[PDB]
Amino acid sequence: PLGSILFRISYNSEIFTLLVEKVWNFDDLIMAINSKISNTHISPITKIKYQDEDGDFVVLGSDEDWNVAKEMLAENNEKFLNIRLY
Numbered sequence: 001p002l003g004s005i006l007f008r009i010s011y012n013s014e015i016f017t018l019l020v021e022k023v024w025n026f027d028d029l030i031m032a033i034n035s036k037i038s039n040t041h042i043s044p045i046t047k048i049k050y051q052d053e054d055g056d057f058v059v060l061g062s063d064e065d066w067n068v069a070k071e072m073l074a075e076n077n078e079k080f081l082n083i084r085l086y
Contacts, residue, residue, distance in 0.1 A: 002022065002073075002074060003022070003079075004019060004020075004021055004022060004079070005019075005020055005021070005022055005070065005073060005079060005080065005081050006018070006019055006020070006079065006080040006081060007019070007020050007032075007033065007080075007081045007082075007083050008080060008081065008082045008083065009033060009036070009037065009083050009085055010082060010083060010084050010085060011085040011086075012085075012086065014085075016036060016037075018032060018033060018036045020032050020033075020081075022070060025063045025066065026060075026061065026062045026063040026065070026066045027063075029066050030046065030048070030061070033045070033048060033083065037085070045085055046061070047059065047060075047061055048060045048061065048083045048084065048085065049083065049084035049086075050065075050069055050081055050082065050083050050084070051081070051082040051084075052069065052072060053072050053075055053076045057084055060083070069081070
């Protein structure tokens with residue numbers, strides 16, 4: 001049952017979880033992480049690399065990449081997600 005998705009912000013040596021709805025386009029999305037990571041409010045990120053079913057990381061900076069992945073979650077049977085922050 002689809003509803004919400006979780007994001008596992010994976011940094012260099014930092015790890016955080018952010019609950020991102022399935023209605024938060026790439027905009028609100030980028031703003032969602034940019035909000036949580038806002039903690040530093042020194043220099044956020046504009047590029048997020050999310051994992052795919054194949055298990056290969058892929059860039060994500062649009063809805064076509066934020067959705068194309070979502071539709072995959074169902075195929076991955078994962079209500080969560082993994083993002084890369086470098």
